[PDB]
Amino acid sequence: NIAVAHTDHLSVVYATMSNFMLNFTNNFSGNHATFKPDQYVITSPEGSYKPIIERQGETVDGLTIIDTSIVWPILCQCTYPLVRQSIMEEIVYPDPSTTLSQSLSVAQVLSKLTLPDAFINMILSGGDSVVMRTYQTEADDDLDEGIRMTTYDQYLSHIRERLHITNVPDPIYITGASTPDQIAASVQATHVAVVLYQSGVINGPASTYLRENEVLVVMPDYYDVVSRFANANLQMNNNRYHESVLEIADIFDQADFIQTSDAVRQLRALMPTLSTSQIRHAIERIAQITDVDSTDYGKLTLRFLGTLTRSLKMQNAQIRRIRPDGTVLRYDDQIDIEAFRWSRYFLDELQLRRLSVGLRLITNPRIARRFNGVRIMYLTDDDPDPD
Amino acid sequence: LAGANTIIAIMRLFTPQGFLRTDDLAIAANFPRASRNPQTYIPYTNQRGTVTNEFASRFRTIVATLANVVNERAVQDDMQKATRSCTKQWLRHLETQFD
Amino acid sequence: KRYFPENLEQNQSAARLVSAVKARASEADISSIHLAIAREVSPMFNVHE
Amino acid sequence: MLQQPTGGYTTLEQFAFTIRNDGTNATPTQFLQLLSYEATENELVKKTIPTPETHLPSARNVPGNVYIEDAITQALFGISAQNVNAHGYFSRLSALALPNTSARLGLDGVIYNSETINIPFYDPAAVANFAATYAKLGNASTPRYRADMIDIYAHVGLELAGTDAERAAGVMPVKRAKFDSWEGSLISLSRDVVNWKILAFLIDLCSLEGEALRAFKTRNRDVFRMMLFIMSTAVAANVVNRKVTKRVDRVLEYIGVNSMRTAGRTATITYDLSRHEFAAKFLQLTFTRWNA
Amino acid sequence: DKGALVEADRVIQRLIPLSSSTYVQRLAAIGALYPNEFTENVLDLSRLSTALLQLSDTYYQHANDQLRRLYRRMYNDSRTLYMTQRHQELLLAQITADPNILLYPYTYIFTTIPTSMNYISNTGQGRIKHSLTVTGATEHDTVADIVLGQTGEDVITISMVE
């Protein structure tokens, strides 16, 4: 009796609902034997990735507990318009506008929600930094000068995941058979002046390459660094180096991965040393300053989403599939959508476009009316002039 | 050790993250001291970066190691399978708490 | 106490891990904490256990 | 009516194509000097370009004066342009294709429906010669007439990166263009080039013949190459920067290979699918004309 | 290659991966190399994929640097159909006969066929019984000792007397 109402009526409801704007995922291929959902996560190179799908213990007001017994009313006690016996009740075709506009209400609520966090993380994207000893190799090297190097731990903790995100071959190990030509080919392959050290001892032309080109060698440890290089100068010495920070912006320079505008750079140069609680406070302030009311549906949705704890670390975050095994896969043209290759700091294209103009505004000399340092000097002030 | 790499690796999680200070003010003050050259291990140096904090980053690698450890762990009972999935989230919470 | 991520404490399948964490997670005292901090620097005489 | 010189309209200083760079108005050639390359193992081989369809799309009855220069240059290099074919006004160029038409193509790049006062325009003969080919931009989108979006780019590679030897051979390694750069370099370049009065370049490309045309091609190779450059950045799979001892080198991988990317990115202008079709069509026509 | 007339539906029976996983790209790459020697033995088709993958993994594993790079090129430009000059000659013929025929357009002709060693590739049952030659083109010098693993009784047993 009901079968016509299902196959010939309800199916179309499903077929429209598949095209609703927010029904964005693939749910089921129709083959129970081999279907696993594609699993995206929002991976920051710093903190742990956050899967979109998981057993996170939210019941969503009990919605995730599935009661199968609902089928009994569906057969044995529910009217359908198609099953007449025959009243011929007219079919209802609901206005698109209601579900549509509530979908849009959700979307705009979410973008406006994320905005302050996304903006701040755009600024700080260069700010992650690694400890870097710079051993000197010349008779009159300045403290900045020499061969930059970092421990392998700092490499894994920052540089590697970022290389995974930029989708490049991993940097070559250098073995002391390494030609400067090979180090060059490696760097132009990965676009980052970096090589993993492997075994000693690095030869002179390679050393002059690494020095002249500011390439960052990556030692397993600092146990006997000068032994690792064949230094003809004998200028290199295990005690002769200078430890210093090295911003990720001083390494990576990708357009929608790491904001490396000199404006944003000097803006960060102005910043006090920051903890994550401070950054969170900055975001919470911008949100305080720019909160703008919702539309009643957006108030209902913000209320429904609950308190926005936002524990997830969005610093340099990206959208990437995990393997079911639990590893994070690299982006794949041939499977992941183009929209996922770069977060673009999670800002709209018009925002980035206006943003570049803003950066021109924020470095104009005329605006720079915060002045640094004063001369004290006892002196008569006939004919004053501020300049 | 040739066959026990995961154990040595988990054991590296315990390595202290600080540095070995000399007790210089105590030596200038001529304070009593049993050691020939007085020293002390500070558990952690102050954050020399502007955003990155090396302690918190170390705990990120530790907890990531530990989570991939729990993930690799075989279980028999269903309930163990559930707790195994839950501890990973717990670890993530910790890591944010430490940061 | 910020022991568990939100929801996970009340989650039914978390119950073992929760009972695990609760087994270890002792209540704070200024005295025990300051002691824990102080003994990193204080000389030890009777060997610790 | 502006008389065409014995050289093209391009000889006139009024039409000079120059991108801003190093604080001056650099000619495209002096910018192309900064370009440098990294050949990869992969190879581009130029297949013969299909002959463009004979069909000229109808310039449907349009009361207004279409701004065609703006439409083409924005379709090819414009930062924000989208859905370039649904309005489909490129067809209008065919109005100029007729002998003794009342329409004129002004130096503003507007297709006036009739001759109008105080609006200087290209010689109708030459515009007929140009429209005879470029009205086919109008059928960029019609399924029967779409141009290849993949193989045509090899020609772009060969005409840009390609050394005289590679161009003789017809095959070149897939290269990776790079130049020392200021912030937002590709964007400013794409606008400086969007501002060009390219219709001069095209009308001369299509109306000149013999030694005049050959002189035109040698004189303007760098202009063509620059348009090719903005386009190649619109299709390049990615555009990284490299630190190079207190200098930054912009790096587009790769020249001559359409990634077919339609996702926006800050570094360069992006082709929506319609722009890809339009550009492929434009490349078909311009390259077919560039070889005669 | 043996010159036989062939009534085949199409000159190249290999698929072109318009979009795919990497394993298929390496399959399509090894496929146009035509590594296999001619063979009349019945194959166990059920495991074919594995075989063809392992072959690929070894072909790249012991090929001279230029052939290696050729393999990589085919592996990245997987959308292209690599084909021998004679294939393309046949396509030219079948186009001239039927101008309206549709053929895959992105193709790359080998100006020169790769000169790799042909691989024996019987995948049916039977131990090989090699008779080793005393000497050969390879000149070994101070080769490292090759340990042989122990075998189960399930694989092979060693009774005292035939």
Curated annotation (Swiss-Prot), chain C:
Q: Where in the cell is it found?
A: Virion
Q: Which organism is it from?
A: Bombyx mori cytoplasmic polyhedrosis virus
Q: Oligomeric state and partners?
A: Homodecamer; each decamer is made up of two conformers of VP2, called VP2A and VP2B. 12 homodecamers assemble to form an icosahedral capsid.
Name the source's superkingdom. Answer: Viruses
- Sum up the protein's function in the record's words: Inner capsid protein that self-assembles to form an icosahedral capsid with a T=2 symmetry, which consists of 120 copies of VP2, with channels at each of its five-fold vertices. This capsid constitutes the innermost concentric layer of the viral mature particle.
Which residues of the whole protein are included? Answer: 446 to 494 of 1333
Lineage of this protein's species?
Answer: Viruses, Riboviria, Orthornavirae, Duplornaviricota, Resentoviricetes
User: How is this protein named in the record?
Assistant: Inner capsid protein VP1
> Which family does the entry's similarity section mention?
Belongs to the turreted BTV-fold inner capsid family.
